[PDB]
Enzyme design. Structure first.
Site, PDB file in Angstrom:
ATOM      1  N   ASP A 253       0.825  -1.213   0.000  1.00  0.00           N
ATOM      2  CA  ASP A 253       0.000   0.000   0.000  1.00  0.00           C
ATOM      3  C   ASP A 253       0.863   1.268   0.000  1.00  0.00           C
ATOM      4  OD1 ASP A 253      -2.545  -1.297  -0.013  1.00  0.00           O
ATOM      5  OD2 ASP A 253      -3.162  -0.468   1.902  1.00  0.00           O
TER       6      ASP A 253
ATOM      7  N   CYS B 262      -2.527   0.748 -13.457  1.00  0.00           N
ATOM      8  CA  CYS B 262      -2.583   0.726 -11.997  1.00  0.00           C
ATOM      9  C   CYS B 262      -3.763   1.607 -11.609  1.00  0.00           C
ATOM     10  CB  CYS B 262      -1.234   1.153 -11.402  1.00  0.00           C
ATOM     11  SG  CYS B 262      -0.457   2.635 -12.180  1.00  0.00           S
ATOM     12  N   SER B 263      -3.650   2.496 -10.617  1.00  0.00           N
ATOM     13  CA  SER B 263      -4.780   3.404 -10.413  1.00  0.00           C
ATOM     14  C   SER B 263      -4.753   4.592 -11.390  1.00  0.00           C
ATOM     15  CB  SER B 263      -4.824   3.881  -8.955  1.00  0.00           C
ATOM     16  OG  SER B 263      -6.082   4.540  -8.731  1.00  0.00           O
ATOM     17  N   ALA B 264      -3.645   5.349 -11.450  1.00  0.00           N
ATOM     18  CA  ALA B 264      -3.555   6.457 -12.413  1.00  0.00           C
ATOM     19  C   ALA B 264      -2.932   6.056 -13.738  1.00  0.00           C
ATOM     20  CB  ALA B 264      -2.744   7.632 -11.826  1.00  0.00           C
ATOM     21  N   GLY B 265      -2.266   4.911 -13.798  1.00  0.00           N
ATOM     22  CA  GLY B 265      -1.598   4.495 -15.024  1.00  0.00           C
ATOM     23  C   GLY B 265      -0.289   5.214 -15.354  1.00  0.00           C
ATOM     24  N   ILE B 266       0.456   5.660 -14.348  1.00  0.00           N
ATOM     25  CA  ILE B 266       1.747   6.327 -14.588  1.00  0.00           C
ATOM     26  C   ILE B 266       2.856   5.855 -13.659  1.00  0.00           C
ATOM     27  CG2 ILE B 266       0.655   8.361 -15.614  1.00  0.00           C
ATOM     28  CD1 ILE B 266       1.065   9.877 -12.985  1.00  0.00           C
ATOM     29  N   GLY B 267       2.519   5.412 -12.453  1.00  0.00           N
ATOM     30  CA  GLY B 267       3.552   5.068 -11.484  1.00  0.00           C
ATOM     31  C   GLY B 267       4.070   3.634 -11.551  1.00  0.00           C
ATOM     32  N   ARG B 268       3.375   2.684 -10.894  1.00  0.00           N
ATOM     33  CA  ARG B 268       3.684   1.263 -11.100  1.00  0.00           C
ATOM     34  C   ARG B 268       3.699   0.896 -12.583  1.00  0.00           C
ATOM     35  NH1 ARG B 268      -0.475  -0.868  -6.382  1.00  0.00           N
ATOM     36  NH2 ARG B 268       0.219   0.686  -4.817  1.00  0.00           N
ATOM     37  N   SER B 269       2.732   1.415 -13.352  1.00  0.00           N
ATOM     38  CA  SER B 269       2.668   1.101 -14.790  1.00  0.00           C
ATOM     39  C   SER B 269       3.938   1.548 -15.507  1.00  0.00           C
ATOM     40  CB  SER B 269       1.444   1.769 -15.427  1.00  0.00           C
ATOM     41  OG  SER B 269       0.192   1.215 -14.984  1.00  0.00           O
TER      42      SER B 269
ATOM     43  N   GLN C  76       6.420   8.075 -10.415  1.00  0.00           N
ATOM     44  CA  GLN C  76       5.764   9.120  -9.618  1.00  0.00           C
ATOM     45  C   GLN C  76       6.577   9.597  -8.424  1.00  0.00           C
ATOM     46  OE1 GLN C  76       1.886   6.834  -9.127  1.00  0.00           O
ATOM     47  NE2 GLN C  76       1.026   8.888  -9.278  1.00  0.00           N
TER      48      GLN C  76
END
Ligand SMILES: Cc1cccc(Nc2ncnc3c2cnn3C)c1
Ligand SMILES: Cc1cccc(Nc2ncnc3c2cnn3C)c1
Length: 284
Positions: A181, A215-222, A262
């Site tokens: 998390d 992912c949630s926003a599509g920029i960090g983990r992605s 991010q």
């Protein structure tokens, strides 16, 4: 500089935040006018994460062709990816329309539906074989075929049917279920194992449309997923693998979608993943 020793030099000097801020300063700025039209407000999860106009994926629809999704096309590596936000209650039908129209084989999900006590994306696939989903706004049917639950990730086989033409296709869902998390994983080993499973499935290969990753926003983990994949492929293709510059690859990818990676912790984790991954490929 090489990667592994540039890495230790940033650790010893404690300058990850300064390196990451340089990237943010140099990153491309392109217009995202379609994302900001008033009719699209309920198609965006976050007001500060939008696809650029020049690289956005268009739905094959004449009413409204907008989805928060971007095509990242890596020319030297010969790989393409679609990076998108986690679907919203009013965009689950658009999401599967995109998968169909772009001829994707695989979907890569890097978040859980609930994290930190809040919803990070809609429950957009069926959880039981006998309870299929119908998306009436885009005329698609989606059925769970099989599910394989492992300690760090789950793989699902799904059937997507275009109800207009009765054509069917098999889609593979690769779900990384153990990203914490807060922060990043301590070791990249399970993330790399997951990446290799996506590769082994054919989902990243040129005989299919681009993989969809979110992912949630599509920029960090992605961003971490596609950056690591592309860097490892370049290290295999080039005569001199130490010439691969992860900061330059990231800035190239940020020509196609804003905000990739991010935090400075995600940047460090990406370095770690590429470094460890390059040892396993060889030739080892
Ligand atoms: C659980 C899971 C996830 C993703 C794909 C698959 N596909 C298969 N898994 C196992 N055996 C299979 C197939 C297809 N044919 N055969 C014979 C299964
Ligand atoms: C989970 C997944 C997705 C996509 C492809 C595969 N492929 C396979 N994975 C493992 N054994 C396999 C095959 C195909 N034949 N045999 C025998 C697995």
């Amino acid at each position: 500089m090489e990667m592994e020793k540039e890495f230790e030099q940033i650790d010893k000097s404690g300058s990850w935040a300064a390196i990451y801020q340089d990237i943010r300063h140099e990153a491309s700025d392109f217009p995202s006018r379609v994302a900001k039209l008033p009719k699209n407000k309920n198609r965006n999860r976050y007001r500060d994460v939008s696809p650029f106009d020049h690289s956005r994926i268009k739905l094959h629809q004449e009413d409204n062709d907008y989805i928060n999704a971007s095509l990242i096309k890596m020319e030297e590596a010969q790989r393409s990816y679609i990076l998108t936000q986690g679907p919203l209650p009013n965009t689950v039908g658009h999401f599967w329309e995109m998968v169909w129209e772009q001829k994707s084989r695989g979907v890569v999900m890097l978040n859980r539906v609930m994290e930190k006590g809040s919803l990070k994306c809609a429950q957009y696939w069926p959880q039981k074989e006998e309870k299929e989903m119908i998306f009436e706004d885009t005329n698609l049917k989606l059925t769970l075929i099989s599910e394989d639950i492992k300690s760090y990730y789950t793989v699902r086989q799904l059937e997507l049917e275009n109800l207009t033409t009765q054509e069917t296709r098999e889609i593979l869902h690769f779900h990384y279920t153990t990203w914490p998390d807060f922060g990043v994983p301590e070791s990249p080993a399970s993330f790399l194992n997951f990446l290799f499973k996506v590769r082994e499935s054919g989902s990243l290969s040129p005989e299919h449309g681009p993989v969809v990753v979110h992912c949630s926003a599509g920029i960090g983990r992605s961003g971490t997923f596609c950056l690591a994949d592309t860097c490892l492929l370049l290290m295999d293709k080039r005569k001199d693998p130490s010439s691969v510059d992860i900061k330059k690859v990231l800035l190239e990818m940020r020509k196609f979608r804003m905000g990739l990676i991010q935090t400075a912790d995600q940047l460090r984790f990406s370095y770690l993943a590429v470094i460890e991954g390059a040892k396993f490929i060889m030739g080892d």
